[PDB]
């Protein structure tokens, strides 16, 4: 049976996600509009830039993130951002559609639209297989949110200094996750292990994105099309 | 009577302008859409970024610009870009409207819309008075294009090294301009002097833009909204 301290963590993680995930998708009209081989790069870069802001808002509300150094916060965000976007995107991914349903018809993102932004199938087929694998797990929102926080709070990320502190935060998150599953998730005896496997999936999707981002950012007529926040978060700087 | 060498310069300046000014304004739908106190900054920054690209295309076709050093080209573009945008914008400015008619109704830019992008009336009233002063001059397109090239090719710009070379290019442009006016512009005995006065107007509009841009770029939640090309061209770097 879950303690009150563990209960508050869940509450604040859920409240943090609800503040930073807009289910109405009404900001998407602000982006440079989509065009349907680089036709989608302006739109999708505005999209990822918006998502990065939501992830920074999310992270700032994880218990104990605010209290890390600014350097540790930046390092954790620069290596995890792309993984939390892929993870948080599961709530609009559709098994029937194989697409991300983000509101109106202009923001239904098929696999065709998403191959038009500089990245290749070596990134996009695994990412799609990840989405259906993760959808099929049918996570409670509490579990989904716990996983985002565990993913962000990984100490085995390049640049982190206070390893032991970040590791203690993540450990207490994992305890809550395993306990929640055992007690509140029927038939979830294997689910903790699968979720941790999906975190490994995420590491691999990260490397392939970083490798391909490198090729975009070395072409100044492409990186020109990104946003300042993307250039800063995905930069090597 | 104008020589053939001077005639070719006019021809190539006119051809350069026609290649880089799209009278249909059909790229404007690509920009982040307008919103009608910073509501217009995303749209207007995409606008100015697009214009900067047209000015680089224009400059690359001025006789002798291509042959300057990359450093001299960059220095001339970083100090003159904002002035050539203001100058080239005269072709869509309207005395009746006091607005820039750029195609459809979403791209009619009144004085209200243009005060919604971080800049104040200290910049916007002079700029509007400049536009009606310049419209009232009724320049032939040859004169308008000659002035853009003379403005770009000024050697009294911070960063230029080959002063004497840039000055010789500009001098030969001025000769063509005074000769054209004398021979092809009826009643233009005063027009050369007014145009040079408008170049002085431009220097003043430049300082005030630079001063106010400084304030935008010191607020990271505003400079975040600019484009990479704007940050690079208007940067102090």
């Amino acid at each position: 049976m879950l303690s009150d301290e563990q209960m508050q963590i869940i509450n604040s993680l859920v409240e943090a996600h609800h503040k930073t995930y807009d289910d109405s998708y009404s900001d998407f009209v602000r982006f440079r509009p989509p065009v349907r081989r680089l036709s989608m790069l302006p739109h999708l870069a505005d999209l990822v830039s918006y998502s990065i802001q939501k992830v920074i808002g999310f992270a700032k509300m994880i218990p104990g993130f605010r209290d890390l150094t600014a350097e540790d916060q930046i390092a954790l965000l620069k290596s995890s951002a792309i993984e939390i976007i892929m993870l948080r995107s599961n709530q609009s991914f559709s098994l029937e559609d194989m697409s991300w349903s983000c509101g109106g018809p202009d923001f239904k993102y098929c696999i065709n639209d998403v191959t038009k932004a500089g990245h290749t199938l070596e990134l996009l087929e695994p990412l799609v297989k990840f989405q259906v694998g993760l959808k099929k797990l049918k996570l409670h929102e509490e579990e989904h949110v716990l996983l985002m926080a565990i993913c962000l709070l990984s100490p085995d990320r390049p640049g982190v200094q206070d390893h032991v502190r970040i590791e203690a935060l993540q450990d207490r998150l994992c305890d809550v996750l395993q306990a929640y599953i055992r007690i509140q998730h029927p038939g979830g005896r294997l689910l903790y292990a699968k979720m941790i496997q999906k975190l490994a999936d995420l590491r691999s999707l990260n490397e392939e994105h970083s490798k391909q981002y490198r090729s975009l950012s070395f072409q100044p007529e492409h990186s020109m099309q990104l946003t300042p926040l993307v250039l800063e978060v995905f930069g090597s700087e | 009577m104008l020589s053939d060498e001077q005639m070719q310069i006019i021809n190539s300046l006119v051809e350069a302008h026609h290649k880089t000014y799209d009278d249909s304004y059909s790229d404007f739908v690509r920009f982040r859409p307008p919103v009608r106190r910073l509501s217009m900054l995303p749209h207007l920054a995409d606008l100015v970024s697009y214009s900067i690209q047209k000015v680089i295309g224009f400059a690359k076709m001025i006789p002798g610009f291509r042959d300057l050093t990359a450093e001299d080209q960059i220095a001339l573009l970083k100090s003159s870009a904002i002035e050539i945008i203001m100058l080239r914008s005269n072709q869509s400015f309207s005395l009746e409207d006091m607005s820039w008619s750029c195609g459809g109704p979403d791209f009619k830019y009144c004085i209200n819309d243009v005060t919604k992008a971080g800049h104040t009336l200290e910049l916007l009233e002079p700029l509007v008075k400049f536009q009606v002063g310049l419209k009232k001059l009724k320049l032939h397109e040859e004169e308008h294009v000659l002035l853009m090239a003379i403005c770009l090719l000024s050697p009294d710009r911070p960063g230029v090294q080959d002063h004497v070379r840039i000055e010789a290019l500009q001098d030969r442009l001025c000769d063509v301009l005074q000769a054209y006016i004398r021979i092809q512009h009826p009643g233009g005995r005063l027009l050369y002097a007014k145009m040079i006065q408008k170049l002085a107007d431009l220097r003043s509009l430049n300082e005030e833009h630079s001063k106010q841009y400084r304030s935008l770029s010191f607020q990271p939640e505003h400079s975040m909204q600019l484009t990479p090309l704007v940050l690079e061209v208007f940067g102090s770097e």
């Binding site: 700032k60 930046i74 965000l77 700087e237 | 939640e221």
Partner: peptide, 10 residues
């Protein structure tokens, strides 16, 4: 370094 990030982190 990381001007925007430092800002968004308050």
């Amino acid at each position: 370094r990381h001007k925007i990030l430092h800002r968004l982190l308050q």
